[PDB]
Design a protein around this ligand. Structure first.
Ligand SMILES: COc1ccncc1C(=O)N1CCN(c2ccc(Cl)c(Cl)c2)[C@H](C(=O)NCc2cccs2)C1
Ligand SMILES: COc1ccncc1C(=O)N1CCN(c2ccc(Cl)c(Cl)c2)[C@H](C(=O)NCc2cccs2)C1
Lengths: 301, 295
């Protein structure tokens, strides 16, 4: 029993975090093979934040403009390049702690564990989802950039996020490991801000099935719905439209509990219209949406 | 900005987890030096002295991944088993064996077949249980804290209670709470909410932009304690007030002034608004954890 926001063990990734300095700016890098990855806004300056021209900035730069330290061991840079908004630093030594890894680009709604570092040392790990508006509600302080979020299937780490910036609203944003931003965000000084978000519908359902497994049923009602009847209501409460692809994905929880997707959809519809009447679900007074169906099966039975 | 249920990096502890088989029972062990620690209910109206006397070193199969470890001795300390092995753990960190107090948090690395599954954050509830997440074969899983380089082990998972909360020992084998590793009626005793952690959580909201609950009122320490009991809260002491000072100085909100914000919420609710993405008060954040995670 029990249901927690659970993150993956961070050990595999701890051995990859190093300190990257360019001039007076420091942030974190990710040491994978003989290459170190970090956000390109490290090569910025005061004078340039408003519209930096990143090709020039890097052309005026030598491998010696980058100080990489892996713990106490200083690393020697032997090349420098930029892929979109990520910098690629070749070092003289490949990391023997390089785990089996992948570079995945996730979809809005998927989740990942985040190992936040400052000065290349880990502080902690926690669980996030990529919002529909491509932000994440993380916990980041000055100099956490280069920190990565990630997932693990057995022995293989799939990297899916790199921390780049904090917005006026206090949520965060970044790139995949190719340098492509999640969302309409750009590493320079503009007025960009977060656009109105929705609730991830399949995730609440994924969370509702988790509640049943753990004894939470007061919200179960005897009714069923159509997908459209359900979809009508969900829009009206700023929920994401639900698809048959989501329904198919939700099946395995359906078979285990014996509750039809649409039949559990009739309960979620009732909750949106009558509230929780004070009651909690899974120790929570809100409808959570940062759990994917996979995460529940992962944590549950 | 932002405030998350944040756990310690698990790497230092991942290097200590092994798979322990005793007859037909498997669970996790914690490999430290040439010694492995695990719950003694692995050897199962019992008699653990008798049972262990009837047990030989080969009755325990310890495997660190594929590296099987050879047991060369076995002893029992309270409710934890100590198996001396032929090999010390080279990934043995600088560590401690501590025992926490009700209210104190710790990170939980849940393991199955000696492999870690995930990491999350816990509080020791007043009734010495923990609201964790454990499935079959997670026993032996550990909780802990970390101060820079030293692992402070403070919990070992043993059992799950009828209510779906959990219970275990310190690393000396003493159970947290009135729980015992045998088939009895033990169950969770009425639980109370940890006020200083709620208050510490309120300072976190200000730091992170949630401020609507700040009011012009104040209370006495006693006045507040009176009301808090009436809502099944723990009494607050001057030590808790002292404990909260550094967050008070940081935010510029008096402890006793923040008690007036919390006093309002207990009797009037959040009237629907959220605090730190939560429609309830959160009491599993300590003053330290906030400082550790915040500016
Ligand atoms: C208190 O600092 C933080 C809090 C939470 N998460 C991260 C940080 C953090 O490390 N930060 C330091 C680097 N900086 C930066 C600088 C240049 C670029 Cl080009 C970019 Cl993209 C990011 C973060 C930023 O957004 N700065 C303001 C912006 C600049 C450009 C777009 S917005 C702030
Ligand atoms: C689904 O299984 C779990 C779910 C969540 N957390 C843990 C487990 C888990 O691994 N479990 C397997 C071992 N077992 C056990 C057996 C003997 C002893 Cl003597 C003790 Cl102490 C514990 C756990 C138990 O409580 N079993 C019932 C009890 C026996 C004695 C007191 S209560 C259940």
């Amino acid at each position: 029993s029990g249901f927690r926001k659970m993150a993956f063990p961070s050990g595999k990734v701890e051995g990859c975090m190093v300190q990257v300095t360019c001039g007076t700016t420091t942030l974190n890098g990710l040491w994978l093979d003989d290459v170190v990855y970090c956000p390109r806004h490290v090569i910025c300056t005061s004078e340039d934040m408003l519209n930096p021209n990143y090709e020039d900035l890097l052309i005026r730069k030598s491998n010696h403009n980058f100080l990489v330290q892996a713990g106490n061991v200083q690393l020697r840079v032997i090349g420098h390049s930029m892929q979109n908004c990520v910098l690629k630093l070749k070092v003289d030594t490949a990391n023997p702690k390089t785990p089996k890894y992948k570079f995945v680009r996730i979809q809005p709604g998927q989740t990942f564990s985040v190992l936040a570092c400052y000065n290349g040392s880990p502080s902690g790990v926690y669980q996030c989802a990529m919002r529909p508006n491509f932000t994440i509600k993380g916990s980041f302080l000055n100099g956490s950039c280069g920190s990565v979020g990630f997932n693990i299937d057995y022995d293989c780490v799939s990297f899916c996020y790199m921390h780049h910036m904090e917005l006026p609203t206090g949520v965060h944003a970044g790139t995949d490991l190719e340098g492509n931003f999640y969302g309409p965000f750009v590493d320079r000084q503009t007025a960009q801000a977060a656009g109105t978000d929705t609730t991830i519908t399949v995730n609440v359902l994924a969370w509702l099935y988790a509640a049943v497994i753990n004894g939470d049923r007061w919200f179960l009602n005897r009714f069923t719905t159509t997908l459209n009847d359900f979809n009508l209501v969900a829009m009206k409460y700023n929920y994401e439209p639900l698809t048959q692809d989501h329904v198919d994905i939700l099946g395995p929880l359906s078979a285990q509990t014996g509750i039809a997707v649409l039949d559990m959809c009739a309960s979620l519809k009732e909750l949106l219209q009558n509230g929780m009447n004070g009651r909690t679900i899974l120790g929570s007074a809100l409808l959570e949406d940062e759990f994917t169906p996979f995460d529940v099966v992962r944590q549950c039975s």
